[PDB]
Amino acid sequence: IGVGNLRNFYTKHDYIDLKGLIDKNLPSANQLEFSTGINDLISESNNWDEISKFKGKKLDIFGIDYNGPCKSKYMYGGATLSGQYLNSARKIPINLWVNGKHKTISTDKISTNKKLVTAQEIDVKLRRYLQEEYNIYGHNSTGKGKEYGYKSKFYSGFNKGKVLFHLNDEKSFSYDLFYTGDGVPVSFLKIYEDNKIIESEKFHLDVEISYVD
Amino acid sequence: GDTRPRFLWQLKFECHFFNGTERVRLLERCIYNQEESVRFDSDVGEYRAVTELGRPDAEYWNSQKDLLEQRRAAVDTYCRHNYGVGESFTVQRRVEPKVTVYPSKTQPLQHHNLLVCSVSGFYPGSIEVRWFRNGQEEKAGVVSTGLIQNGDWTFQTLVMLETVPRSGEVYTCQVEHPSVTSPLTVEWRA
Amino acid sequence: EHVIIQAEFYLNPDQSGEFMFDFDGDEIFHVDMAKKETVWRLEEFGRFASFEAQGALANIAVDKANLEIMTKRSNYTPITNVPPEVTVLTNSPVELREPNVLICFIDKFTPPVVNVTWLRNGKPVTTGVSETVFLPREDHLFRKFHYLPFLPSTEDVYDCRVEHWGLDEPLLKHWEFD
């Protein structure tokens, strides 16, 4: 079930992308909550040092609701302080190795006008791009990636891969691109609960995707 | 013999770093027979002919918009990338100097003795080597090799002091280098 | 503060090319064009990093074709030979029968073609010898280092013999432990 839920939650469902939401300043040290109209959204985290600074404030949110349709909206992390923007969106510079063959990517499809952006936002965008172009998780909506085959559990040409966030002046970190957890979004999306924020101008991505027989 | 004329083409992609990766400049250069003909400089943002011979290339490459986009992103994906990849064993490479003092095998200056402080095997190249006589620095009568690169990721330097050795005197060579918290000292007694 | 240079060249009619990375004057790595492999300057470098050798070979192919373009565009203007400056030194002070290494440093020359021979007492010596590739300089001439491990003795006399087209005769550079 991890395969269909990884594909669906990352690439089929619309991500959350809202600017200028005001956290409600509630007692919880593991949750932020904002009005989104008639309903409210809750961002769960495990990082009080980070999150205490966002309590009560105007935040921009971006990521994936782990509950999915028909349930209440909950997500992991995804928050940044509103009001700090670049003059235009920054295309994130990317090295990508496909089965070991390198190329450079620069696309508006993976970009941000946020001075400070979440690793989640970038990683979601990366993943939606890679699915569209390389059919990474199987059954994409574009028909591209024909040439990689369908041998993986995903019905695609790939079952291995990582995104490294190569930061200029902090310690670098990587996410596994094909990690499913115990199978449900509330498990594999948990990697995002730290609400990791990076300076959008001060990094690049080194991305690898491949197939292990 | 083979005295046929030679024709040489050199390429250099240079990443210049200032304050770590804080400020980076990429300079891509084409060099024909030791003369640079065309370059991309990231502070300009396009190709420019350096000589008339490279003018066709600047014009051609400047019309390829995907190419210029790649070169502009290259300060991150290439320069800052390779910096990071090699950082641990290049930027942060630390090798401690081996310090010795010896009187010269020549003493051609009558009763003026020559004392050599040899500082070898170290990395990086930033080093300070000071001579002391009785705890007081000697600036005069000092002659140096300057920094010598061995080509194997180590440097050496030799600092020679001329002095008249009087009995009781303590001569000290003192080395400060990034590989050590506190100065390295070698003592020589007259 | 730091400079990393990826430096390649192609040379005709010798049909020889090289691909290397330089960090602050020292070689990180080069590609062996014959073996199609990455050769680290210090072996331990290879434990922490990798480079795909085939990318060097692809770049060299383009360099070769471009050299031919420039040879014609210049109306067959050839290079002016610039002779090397040669220096023999050791890597550390020399002590009687304590292993050391003789360095023959060849500098400020172009084109990048040399024949280097170490001689001990007139006779050629190959035991344990090694050398760098052609290293860049900011004036676009080349540097190269050759190495001979040796056991210091009072009776031996060494020469580094360097041949380059810019030179009027082979350069013999003497070294002895006295």
Binding site: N95, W97, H102, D206 | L11, F13, E28, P56, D57, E59, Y60, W61, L67, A74, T77, Y78, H81, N82, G84, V85, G86 | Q6, E8, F19, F21, I28, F29, F48, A49, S50, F51, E52, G55, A56, A58, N59, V62, D63, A65, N66, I69, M70
Partner: peptide, 13 residues
Amino acid sequence: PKYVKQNTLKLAT
């Protein structure tokens, strides 16, 4: 961790 080269480009013809 992988070193990245810049591609050499074909000259104008």
